[PDB]
């Protein structure tokens, strides 16, 4: 009962949610909502204000935000794709959270992200050097995700 796809995705405002959407249409997998124990506010992402929550999780490479609850067991999938925003050229901390919270062996984990202009470049090398046993496969950055941007990047 393994060899299946998970697409987990973090969101705060919705729009990795809607490319997620896609992706996991697109692949036949399961979709999964990477959920912070304390949802992100507007206050939490003034990106302006140094004092804001994602101002300082976001300046704290060791900061991990706690998720809503623990994580299931991960043995059934071979593939993972994980979604993100882009904060600040990286992933938000929740997923180093996520990753620090599953076992990742003999997968094939994906990072796909959304941002306001900013390529995935930094945000998935800096996964990659973090978590070197992990299979990465190459990322993309999805704006302005639609079932033919997405379809195009799946069947390739
Ligand atoms: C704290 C914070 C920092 C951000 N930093 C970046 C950035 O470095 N580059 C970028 O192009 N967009 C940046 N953005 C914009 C988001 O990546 C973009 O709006 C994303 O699509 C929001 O996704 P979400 O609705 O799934 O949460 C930032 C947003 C926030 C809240
Ligand atoms: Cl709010
Ligand atoms: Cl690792």
Redesign the pocket.
């Known amino acids: 009962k393994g060899g299946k796809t998970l697409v987990a995705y973090?969101?705060?405002?919705?729009?990795?949610?809607r490319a997620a959407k896609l992706v996991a249409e697109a692949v036949d997998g399961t979709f999964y909502e990477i959920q912070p124990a304390k949802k992100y506010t507007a206050a939490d992402?003034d990106?302006h204000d140094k004092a804001?929550r994602?101002?300082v999780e976001?300046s704290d490479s060791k900061s991990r935000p706690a998720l809503y609850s623990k994580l299931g067991s991960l043995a059934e999938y071979d593939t993972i794709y994980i979604g993100?925003?882009?904060?600040?050229?990286?992933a938000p901390r929740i997923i180093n959270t996520f990753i620090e919270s599953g076992d990742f062996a003999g997968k094939t984990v994906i990072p796909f992200?959304?941002?306001?202009?900013?390529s995935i470049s930094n945000a998935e090398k800096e996964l990659q050097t973090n978590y070197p046993g992990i299979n990465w496969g190459k990322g993309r950055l999805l704006?302005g995700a639609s079932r033919e941007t997405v379809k195009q990047w799946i069947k390739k």
């Open positions: 973090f969101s705060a405002t919705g729009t990795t949610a992402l990106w804001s994602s101002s976001m993100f925003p882009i904060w600040w050229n990286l992200a959304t941002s306001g202009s900013s704006n």
